[PDB]
Ligand binder design. Structure first.
Ligand code: NAG
Ligand code: CA
Lengths: 48, 96
């Protein structure tokens, strides 16, 4: 009943932004940002 | 690119060609890399020593040489044949 929905809205927007800045690479190649965003996926998964 | 010009323009070399075969070079850039390596080999003479190596999260030679070779017609042909066989797969690692 608290304004706890707005926090979830903001974290959903953050998850969307994280998905957007992901850069697909060919043939199992990666960069540092992609490795960083993969770890961040656990932060969203546990909160949800 | 003539042999006499190349001879008179510099001194004998110890060249080592380091080719990136990580995943991101897949496509047009790999084909251009192969052609460019062949063209660069075309500029070497019998006083020059060359070897071609590749790396994708692990560095290795492209052929059965494993060190610098005389870069005569036969060795250059072997290096060209080995270079026109590399595929792009893996993660880039410049330190290795
Ligand atoms: C992936 C693979 O099998 N590559 C080989 C290459 O190393 C070799 O030089 C060539 C013989 O011309 O046959 C092919
Ligand atoms: Ca790369």
């Amino acid at each position: 009943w608290k304004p706890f929905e707005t926090i979830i809205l903001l974290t959903i927007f953050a998850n969307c932004v994280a998905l957007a800045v992901y850069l697909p690479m060919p043939e199992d190649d990666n960069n540092s940002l992609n490795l960083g965003l993969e770890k961040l996926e656990y932060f969203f998964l546990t909160v949800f | 690119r003539r042999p006499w010009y190349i001879q008179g323009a510099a001194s004998p070399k110890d060249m080592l060609i380091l080719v990136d075969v990580s995943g991101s070079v897949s496509g047009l850039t790999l084909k251009l890399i192969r052609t460019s390596v062949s063209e660069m080999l075309e500029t070497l003479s019998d006083d020059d020593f060359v070897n071609v190596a590749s790396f994708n999260s692990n560095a290795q030679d492209v052929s059965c040489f494993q060190h610098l070779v005389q870069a005569n017609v036969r060795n250059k042909k072997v290096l060209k044949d080995a270079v026109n066989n590399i595929t792009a797969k893996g993660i880039t690692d410049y330190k290795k």
